[PDB]
Design a protein around this motif. Structure first.
Motif, short mmCIF file in Angstrom:
data_model
loop_
_atom_site.label_atom_id
_atom_site.label_comp_id
_atom_site.label_asym_id
_atom_site.label_seq_id
_atom_site.Cartn_x
_atom_site.Cartn_y
_atom_site.Cartn_z
N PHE A 1 8.59 -4.44 -40.06
CA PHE A 1 7.17 -4.15 -40.20
C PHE A 1 6.83 -2.77 -39.65
O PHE A 1 6.08 -2.02 -40.27
CB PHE A 1 6.36 -5.23 -39.50
CG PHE A 1 4.90 -4.91 -39.37
CD1 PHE A 1 4.06 -4.99 -40.46
CD2 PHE A 1 4.37 -4.53 -38.15
CE1 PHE A 1 2.72 -4.70 -40.33
CE2 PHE A 1 3.03 -4.24 -38.02
CZ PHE A 1 2.21 -4.32 -39.11
N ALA B 1 3.01 -7.19 -43.57
CA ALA B 1 2.07 -7.72 -42.59
C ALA B 1 2.02 -9.24 -42.64
O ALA B 1 1.97 -9.90 -41.59
CB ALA B 1 0.68 -7.13 -42.82
N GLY B 2 2.03 -9.81 -43.84
CA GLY B 2 2.04 -11.26 -43.96
C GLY B 2 3.29 -11.88 -43.38
O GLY B 2 3.23 -12.92 -42.72
N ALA B 3 4.44 -11.25 -43.62
CA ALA B 3 5.68 -11.75 -43.03
C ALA B 3 5.68 -11.59 -41.51
O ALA B 3 6.18 -12.46 -40.79
CB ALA B 3 6.88 -11.02 -43.64
N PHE B 4 5.13 -10.49 -41.02
CA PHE B 4 5.05 -10.25 -39.58
C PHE B 4 4.18 -11.30 -38.90
O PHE B 4 4.52 -11.79 -37.82
CB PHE B 4 4.49 -8.85 -39.34
CG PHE B 4 4.49 -8.42 -37.90
CD1 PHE B 4 5.65 -7.99 -37.29
CD2 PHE B 4 3.32 -8.42 -37.17
CE1 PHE B 4 5.65 -7.58 -35.98
CE2 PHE B 4 3.31 -8.02 -35.85
CZ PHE B 4 4.48 -7.60 -35.25
N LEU B 5 3.07 -11.67 -39.53
CA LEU B 5 2.19 -12.68 -38.95
C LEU B 5 2.78 -14.08 -39.09
O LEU B 5 2.70 -14.89 -38.16
CB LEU B 5 0.81 -12.62 -39.60
CG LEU B 5 -0.04 -11.40 -39.22
CD1 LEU B 5 -1.17 -11.22 -40.21
CD2 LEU B 5 -0.59 -11.54 -37.80
N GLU B 6 3.38 -14.38 -40.24
CA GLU B 6 3.91 -15.72 -40.48
C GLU B 6 5.22 -15.94 -39.74
O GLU B 6 5.47 -17.03 -39.21
CB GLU B 6 4.09 -15.95 -41.98
CG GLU B 6 4.43 -17.38 -42.39
CD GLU B 6 3.30 -18.36 -42.10
OE1 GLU B 6 2.17 -17.91 -41.81
OE2 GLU B 6 3.55 -19.58 -42.16
N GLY B 7 6.07 -14.91 -39.68
CA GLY B 7 7.36 -15.02 -39.02
C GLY B 7 7.34 -14.54 -37.58
O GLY B 7 8.30 -13.93 -37.12
N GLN B 8 6.24 -14.80 -36.87
CA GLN B 8 6.14 -14.35 -35.49
C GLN B 8 7.21 -14.92 -34.57
O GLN B 8 7.71 -14.16 -33.71
CB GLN B 8 4.74 -14.67 -34.93
CG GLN B 8 3.66 -13.66 -35.30
CD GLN B 8 3.88 -12.28 -34.69
OE1 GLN B 8 4.75 -12.10 -33.84
NE2 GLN B 8 3.10 -11.31 -35.13
N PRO B 9 7.58 -16.20 -34.63
CA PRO B 9 8.69 -16.67 -33.77
C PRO B 9 9.99 -15.93 -33.99
O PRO B 9 10.71 -15.63 -33.02
CB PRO B 9 8.81 -18.15 -34.14
CG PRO B 9 7.46 -18.53 -34.60
CD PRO B 9 6.90 -17.33 -35.29
N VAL B 10 10.32 -15.60 -35.24
CA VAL B 10 11.55 -14.87 -35.51
C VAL B 10 11.46 -13.45 -34.95
O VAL B 10 12.45 -12.90 -34.46
CB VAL B 10 11.84 -14.86 -37.03
CG1 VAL B 10 13.17 -14.16 -37.33
CG2 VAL B 10 11.85 -16.29 -37.56
N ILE B 11 10.27 -12.85 -35.01
CA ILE B 11 10.08 -11.53 -34.42
C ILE B 11 10.24 -11.60 -32.91
O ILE B 11 10.88 -10.73 -32.29
CB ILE B 11 8.70 -10.97 -34.81
CG1 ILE B 11 8.59 -10.73 -36.33
CG2 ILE B 11 8.39 -9.69 -34.04
CD1 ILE B 11 9.38 -9.56 -36.86
N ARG B 12 9.67 -12.63 -32.28
CA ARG B 12 9.69 -12.73 -30.83
C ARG B 12 11.10 -12.99 -30.30
O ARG B 12 11.51 -12.41 -29.29
CB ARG B 12 8.73 -13.82 -30.37
CG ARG B 12 7.27 -13.47 -30.60
CD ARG B 12 6.41 -14.71 -30.69
NE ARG B 12 5.01 -14.39 -30.99
CZ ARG B 12 4.05 -14.18 -30.10
NH1 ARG B 12 4.28 -14.24 -28.80
NH2 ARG B 12 2.83 -13.89 -30.53
N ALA C 1 -3.69 -22.47 -39.00
CA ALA C 1 -2.67 -21.86 -38.16
C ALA C 1 -2.90 -22.22 -36.70
O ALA C 1 -4.03 -22.42 -36.26
CB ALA C 1 -2.67 -20.34 -38.34
N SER D 1 2.91 -13.51 -51.98
CA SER D 1 1.49 -13.75 -51.73
C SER D 1 0.70 -12.46 -51.63
O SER D 1 -0.47 -12.41 -52.04
CB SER D 1 1.32 -14.57 -50.45
OG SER D 1 2.03 -15.78 -50.54
#
Ligand code: A1IRY
Ligand SMILES: Nc1ncnc2c1ncn2[C@@H]1O[C@H](COP(=O)(O)OP(=O)(O)OP(=O)(O)O)[C@@H](O)[C@H]1O
Ligand SMILES: Nc1ncnc2c1ncn2[C@@H]1O[C@H](COP(=O)(O)OP(=O)(O)OP(=O)(O)O)[C@@H](O)[C@H]1O
Ligand SMILES: [Mg+2]
Ligand SMILES: [Mg+2]
Ligand SMILES: [Zn+2]
Lengths: 559, 563
Positions: free
Chosen positions: A214, A193-204, A456, A107
């Motif tokens: 990221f 950045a898009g993956a960081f925003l979309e994959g926030q639960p996995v980051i957390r 979202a 994207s």
């Protein structure tokens, strides 16, 4: 391939060049008039001539300003309209490329293409030709005038000009490779950045901020930006210092004061240099700063035209109702990596085909092949006897509706999501479709009802959004329906209710079902077992159980 | 500029003061150099042109000093711009994982993406490209007007009066196109979000025939974005004209006073000729400020987005840590209530889960069983009540200790755009190769490695879109199992798997050697065989719980659920 892309602007750019030559001449004329005014002042001329010269110079300054403003306004409107038409072309192109293009790009790449490249064309198609013509005309005219006035003090003006040219050339050579690498870094940073925003639960849950790719990519990008912009900005500031009016004024005086003090030059002969010798530096700095913009615009044009030349799903002109037929179909996402291997199948009206098999066997890709998201490498796919390559997108997707495995909701109201395939459908139809999908009650519980947005954050549960997509397919009401792992997130009660509704609504329709839950597809007229991209056995539920093959093993594993 | 100083690192204020001192020194040197021509030309045109050597020497000193103060001001501006860039991006990167999930609305998500997208060279070179020329241009005619008081008092006042209209034009210009520039930004960001939606939802939009510009949402956003951009061009016309009229008004006052003094004889003819050159230097910043006015507005919008992310409300957190190291904790809900907005999700859910035992949560869609897992993991926090891990409230835990306590398999698995091995290594980046292979073997990802040509080096797509639904699901299982956390939350981890993989994965969750307090959500009976306890959640309430065999014999909701 920027020439081919920017050919439609052939006449506006030439007009910009010639009009900018005229505008810079009109901008230089006031200072010639002011030199004459100063010469008359030293001679004690009558006040009438001085007033005439001053008023003429002021009016010419105003005329040059208004003409430059009008030219910039017109050229910016031209650039805006060109960007709009080009973005429409890019969206039309992307609307019929294979989905593998989107999957291998991402994207962030599409966003950089449609928006960032078209915006990178701005300087190239709005400022490059004017800046070039101004920086060619004004220095040449001024230097010719000043060499006529005095060659000794005119020669010293070549020192800042030659220094500026050397600085510009070395700056461009140094920064070319980094400008080439910049869009790749921008695309990568946008993707991260898009993956960081979309994959926030996995980051957390996993790693947090510290252990995120990221942050590493951000540090690398900042290092690249520093290494690019440090020498570039240093050269840029040196070029600004060289061409500044103060520098020209100082070097003019350093050349002229020794001449005037000696009996070598009349001071009146310095009036041109002080009034014209400090006018053309900014115009030179314009092209000096614009060379990088020209390079970025050229690369952006190359990328845009490369995408616009991309092969697409061309609709052939070659040119039972409700029937789908796959004939020796093979498919490869990547060359040399088969995923479908000589699949022959026939989905007929009034029948249910259950496509089951191991995970990753190729059920979803086969469904996508029926949708013509990709073209079959071999074989053919026909709908109502018509090869899908001969059908337009409207013709294809009015006959075959799809409930994809991933429940993709668009940003908008729930009514918009249910009415995606028919936005003009009335509210009563949307409510009936939602009731058939066992989702009308949940939408009723929402605060806005059917107008509640699905962006979202204001999401649903997995089963609820799956039911919303099922309602979308129900509202589409195609003769052929495909259901890729529908009701996978549904509980048994909701699954039973929605399957009963689907059976009611598709009694006389062609239905393809993909289900890992084999207990929900025992009633199918046909059951096709797909293993390793090929059909390994076909039959009914009882026949496949008696066969003792892959279906028997999966059924035993399921109990 | 106050917002910029708010974003400067606190350990970089020494450079800002040095930058501000050299910026003023640069302006004064430029102004003094312009006005030194007036003595220089009067001496040069006099009967003793040798008197101009003194003023040429002072012009050389002011010119040389201006070069040094400008190279240094550029060096400091470059450092300040990149120093501000690194802190803001690092601060946003660190803050965003701690921001409450409710903050991520589509508008806020767009703001965060655009704030991160400003990492490019435009924001990094803000000081050199915007502040240095804007401050230099704004103060130069004021400095020239001050330096002309030493030449002639009424001349300097006329020059100063022309700067009052310069700042007047600068103040009013932003307000003329404020609304148009706002709508242009809104339609531009909206167009950005539709392009990403266009690429992500490409398959569903094509089936709906909502993919052409005449019928797509991105096409409507393009038309709105174009119309707003054309409106912005027209509404910026008053701003540019206003700066032009300021320069015209400034020219008349400067030139009018110079002509008036010369006719009065208070100003010499050579001095007035030198004042034409000074007048050109005095009017250059009027044109430069007009060019920088559009850049000032986009910068103000950019810094507002960055400040919006840094002002985002973070989740409550403490400093507590779990007592035991690696032991399975107890999970208990103490009258936990949760709500998304005004809609109640959970209403007084209370239970306790024994250490190191597997629990199953089952129930209808939308009952709230995914919200229960998020509360245990700390992704969401209760409206009231308290979730306790080994008797310790989760909201009081250290964030480092809170994430280390729970590993999650999410309902909708999300892989990052890279290789398959990198996505598995997210669970424990320092894990040994034996641990990584053990996790992949348990999750039946070892089947993929031989099945796929590249093995674990297979470059996954955005999300996990270059893998099948069950293949990326098993990759997310291997990720969770690799993490050594003592709590495992499994959220329908065999939804996209066939019976053969469902059975192997379900046995693998039980066969994990290390102790874990396991909570499993599933819509399949065969996925909860090894659960020691079951929780039937319906409408955010545990209707019944107990052993699997006990609940089947009871003939309640659990028996009817699988009937
Ligand atoms: C396009 C591009 C390309 C190329 C090709 C094509 C071409 C086309 C053509 C077009 C043309 C148009 C033109 C128009 C105009 C004309 C010229 C100029 C003329 C002129 O200029 Fe004047 O003015 C103006 C306006 N005005 C108007 O509006 C009017 C009323 C108000 O006017 C009057 O009456 C008055 C008086 C004086 C005389 C006239 N005057 O001067 N005035 C006035 O006010 C004045 C005051 O101060 C001034 C100045 C000062 C300083 C500096 C400069 C100047 O100058 N001033 C115009 C604009 C601009 C601006 N200004 O400025
Ligand atoms: N981000 C959100 N914003 C608003 N409401 C939400 C959000 N996520 C979930 N909900 C609502 O919370 C309620 C419970 O959601 P949850 O995700 O816990 O469902 P669930 O029981 O896991 O469902 P399923 O079995 O269908 O996966 C549902 O009404 C859902 O609409
Ligand atoms: N975009 C893609 N690029 C490359 N390979 C892909 C892509 N999408 C799918 N594949 C591969 O296609 C093969 C078959 O996947 P597919 O999704 O068609 O199977 P499936 O039977 O629907 O799977 P599942 O039951 O797990 O949903 C898998 O090996 C997957 O790796
Ligand atoms: Mg699939
Ligand atoms: Mg759920
Ligand atoms: Zn422009």
């Amino acid at each position: 391939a920027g020439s081919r892309l920017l050919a439609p602007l052939k006449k506006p750019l030439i007009v910009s060049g010639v009009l900018q030559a005229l505008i810079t001449l009109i901008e230089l004329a006031p200072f010639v008039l002011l030199v004459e005014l100063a010469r008359l002042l030293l001679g004690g001329a009558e006040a009438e001539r001085l007033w005439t010269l001053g008023l003429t110079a002021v009016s010419l300054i105003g005329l040059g300003a208004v003409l430059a403003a009008a030219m910039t306004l017109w050229l910016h409107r031209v650039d805006a309209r060109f960007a709009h038409e080009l973005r429409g072309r890019l969206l039309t192109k992307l609307s019929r490329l294979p989905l593998g293009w989107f999957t291998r790009r991402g994207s962030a790449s599409t966003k950089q293409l449609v928006q960032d490249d078209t915006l990178a064309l701005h300087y190239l198609i709005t400022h490059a030709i004017p800046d070039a013509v101004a920086a060619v005309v004004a220095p040449v005219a001024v230097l010719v005038y000043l060499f006529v006035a005095d060659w000794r003090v005119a020669l010293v003006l070549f020192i800042p000009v030659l220094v500026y040219l050397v600085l510009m050339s070395v700056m461009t050579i140094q920064s070319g490779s980094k400008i080439a690498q910049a869009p790749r870094w921008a695309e990568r940073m946008g993707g991260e950045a898009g993956a960081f925003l979309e994959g926030q639960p996995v980051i957390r849950i996993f790693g947090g901020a510290a252990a995120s790719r990221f942050r590493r990519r951000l540090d690398d990008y900042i290092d690249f930006l520093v290494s690019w912009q440090r020498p570039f900005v240093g050269k840029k500031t040196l070029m600004d210092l060289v061409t500044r009016p103060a520098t020209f004024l100082w070097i003019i005086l350093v050349a002229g004061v020794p001449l005037v003090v000696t009996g070598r030059m009349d001071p009146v002969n310095l009036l041109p240099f002080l009034l014209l010798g400090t006018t053309f530096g900014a115009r030179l700095l314009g092209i000096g700063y614009g060379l990088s913009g020209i390079q970025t615009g050229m690369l952006a044009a190359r990328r845009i035209q490369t995408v616009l030349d991309e092969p697409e799903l061309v609709v052939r002109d070659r040119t039972r109702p409700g029937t789908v037929e796959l004939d020796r179909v093979s498919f490869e996402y990547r060359p040399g990596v088969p995923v479908i291997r000589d699949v022959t199948l026939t989905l007929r009206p009034g029948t249910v085909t259950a496509l089951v098999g191991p995970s990753g066997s190729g059920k979803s890709t086969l469904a996508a092949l029926v949708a013509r998201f990709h073209d079959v490498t071999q074989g053919a796919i026909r709908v109502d006897g018509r090869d899908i390559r001969t059908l337009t997108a409207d013709e294809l997707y009015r006959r075959v509706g799809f409930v994809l495995q991933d429940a993709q909701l668009v940003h908008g109201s729930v009514a918009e999501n249910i009415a995606l395939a028919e936005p003009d459908a009335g509210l009563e139809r949307i409510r009936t479709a939602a009731r058939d999908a066992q989702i009308h009650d949940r939408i009723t519980r929402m605060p806005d009802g059917y107008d509640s947005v699905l962006g979202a954050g204001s999401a649903l549960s997995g089963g609820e959004r799956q039911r919303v997509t099922i309602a979308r397919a129900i509202l589409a009401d195609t003769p052929v329906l495909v259901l890729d792992q529908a009701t996978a997130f549904a509980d048994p009660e909701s699954e039973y209710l929605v399957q009963q509704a689907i059976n009611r609504l598709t009694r006389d329709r062609t239905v393809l079902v993909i289900a890992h839950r084999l207990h929900t597809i025992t009633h199918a007229d046909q059951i096709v077992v797909l293993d390793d991209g090929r059909i390994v056995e076909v039959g009914t539920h009882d026949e496949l159980l008696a066969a003792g093959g892959r279906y028997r093993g999966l059924w035993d594993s399921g109990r | 500029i106050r917002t910029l100083l708010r974003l400067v690192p606190a350990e970089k204020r020494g450079a800002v003061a040095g930058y501000a001192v050299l910026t003023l020194l640069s302006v004064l040197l430029r102004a003094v150099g312009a006005v030194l021509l007036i003595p220089l030309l009067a001496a040069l045109f006099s009967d003793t042109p040798s008197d101009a050597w003194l003023w040429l020497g002072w012009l050389t000193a002011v010119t040389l000093a201006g070069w040094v103060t400008d190279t240094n001001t550029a060096r400091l501006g470059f450092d300040l711009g990149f120093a501000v860039l690194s802190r803001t991006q690092h601060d946003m990167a660190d803050r965003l994982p701690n921001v409450a999930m409710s903050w991520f609305t589509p508008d806020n998500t767009a703001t965060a993406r655009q704030a991160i997208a400003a990492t490019g060279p435009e924001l990094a070179g803000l000081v050199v490209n915007l502040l240095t020329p804007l401050i230099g241009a704004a103060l130069l005619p004021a400095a020239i007007g001050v330096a002309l008081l030493f030449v002639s008092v009424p001349l300097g006042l006329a020059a100063l009066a022309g700067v009052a209209v310069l700042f007047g034009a600068l103040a009013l210009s932003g307000r003329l196109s404020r609304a148009a520039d706002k709508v242009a930004g809104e339609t531009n960001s909206a167009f950005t979000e539709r392009i990403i939606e266009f690429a992500r939802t490409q398959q569903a939009l094509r089936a709906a025939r909502r993919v052409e510009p005449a019928r797509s949402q991105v096409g409507s956003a393009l038309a709105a974005q174009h119309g707003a951009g054309l409106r912005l061009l027209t509404m910026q016309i008053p701003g540019q004209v206003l700066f032009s009229l300021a320069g015209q008004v400034a020219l008349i006052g400067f030139a009018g006073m110079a002509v008036w003094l010369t006719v009065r004889g208070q100003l010499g003819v050579p001095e007035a000729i030198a004042l034409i050159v000074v007048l050109v230097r005095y009017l250059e910043p009027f044109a430069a400020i007009a060019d920088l006015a559009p850049a000032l507005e986009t910068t103000r919008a950019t810094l507002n987005r960055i400040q919006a992310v840094l002002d985002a409300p973070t989740l409550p957190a403490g400093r507590r840590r779990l007592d035991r190291t690696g032991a399975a904790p107890s999970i208990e809900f103490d009258d936990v209530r949760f709500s998304y907005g005004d809609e109640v999700v959970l209403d007084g859910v209370s239970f306790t889960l024994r250490p190191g035992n597997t629990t199953a949560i089952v129930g209808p869609s939308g009952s709230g069983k995914t919200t229960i897992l998020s509360l245990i993991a700390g992704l969401q926090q209760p409206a009231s009540g308290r979730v306790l891990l080994d008797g310790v409230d989760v909201t009081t835990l250290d964030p480092e200790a809170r994430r280390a306590a729970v590993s999650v398999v999410f309902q909708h698995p999300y892989l990052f755009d890279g290789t398959l091995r990198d996505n598995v290594l997210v669970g424990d980046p320092e894990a040994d190769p034996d641990d990584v292979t053990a996790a992949m073997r348990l999750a039946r990802v070892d089947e993929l490695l031989d099945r796929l040509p590249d093995g674990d080096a297979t470059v996954v797509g955005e999300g996990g879109t270059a893998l099948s639904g069950g293949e990326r699901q098993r990759v997310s299982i291997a990720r969770a199992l690799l993490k050594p956390a003592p709590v495992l939350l499994v959220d329908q981890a065999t939804s996209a798997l066939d019976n053969a993989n469902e059975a192997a994965v379900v046995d693998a969750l039980t066969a994990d050697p290390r102790p874990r307090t396991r909570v499993i959500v599933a819509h399949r009976l065969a996925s909860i065989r090894h659960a020691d306890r079951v929780l039937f959640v319906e409408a955010g309430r545990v209707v019944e719980d107990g052993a699997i065999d006990e609940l089947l014999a009871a003939g309640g909701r659990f028996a009817q659920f699988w009937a």
